[PDB]
Amino acid sequence: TTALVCDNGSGLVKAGFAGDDAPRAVFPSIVGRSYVGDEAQSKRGILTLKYPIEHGIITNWDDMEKIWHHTFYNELRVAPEEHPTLLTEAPLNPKANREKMTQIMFETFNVPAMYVAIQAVLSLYASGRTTGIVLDSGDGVTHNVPIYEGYALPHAIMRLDLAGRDLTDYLMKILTERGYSFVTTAEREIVRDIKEKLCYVALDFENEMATAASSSSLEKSYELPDGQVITIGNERFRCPETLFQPSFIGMESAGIHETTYNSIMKCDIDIRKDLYANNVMSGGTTMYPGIADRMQKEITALAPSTMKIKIIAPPERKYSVWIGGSILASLSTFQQMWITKQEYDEAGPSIVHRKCF
């Protein structure tokens, strides 16, 4: 039999079979009330759409059950009782939530076995590492997660409620300042597309701003669904600059470069070196051209000159969490780590705490 891997994001579900190079199912994490994912969107003007996962944490369990059902039966076309299933969770996911995921997998879906891994840990594993610090940033939440020998270090984890959806909202705001108007849910989707296709991170923000002066060499045109053509200029890099300057959207938080530094500085002196040399980026919001080079530059400025800095950001990093799960679930020596149905029946949902770490 084959293991399943499901990475349930605030924005997108990534699901597929262990051993595959990529998730075969990638679809919106929405339920419309009934309808799930891409079917829900197409039927939006009759159903009422909702995101069951908020900032990486499951908040609507009845809708989450719908997502998992749709994942097994409609996307993957499997019987869940025939497949061990690896799920993912956010750093700092509450104990009760892990228990509820476990209870549902065994009691509702009758999986023969399951496991739940921290998303950032899987990102690290996908790069062939067990020690490093991961910047994982998706649609709903961003974390800095230092990890030593597979263990996320809870006291040093940084959570930031600034991610992809927030960047989309900010881009709507600043494009609206240039004379355009993006306000509705439908219009937000257009702006998400603009963001994904045209935004980038400047190496030197102030210099890039000054460049948007000397010229229009940074300007791109974008055709709207109604055929109107708009022009985007310094918004291309002002949008993700917010990750380095959260004050752009009024947040008091330090930017992702400083929170990376702060996270490392909370860790044991003798592992700091290993964290600096193994900075892995994962998630859709790390996909901006220029982001790795900018992180390299900002971390170098904060760190001792004695420190070797390495940013690891592979082309496939949008899916590194899923890919890490695919690798882990396919390991021969991982088979002893699954929670089996037998162990569950004997121990109940709390089994997840002693098996999944």
Binding site: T130, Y148, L153, C267, I327
Partner: peptide, 28 residues
Amino acid sequence: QIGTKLTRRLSQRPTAEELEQRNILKPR
């Protein structure tokens, strides 16, 4: 060799208790 090497790095993984004893693993 991700799978193999990761298997090896995961093979000799320490326990939570011994990372705690070494002041590496701490509660929030």
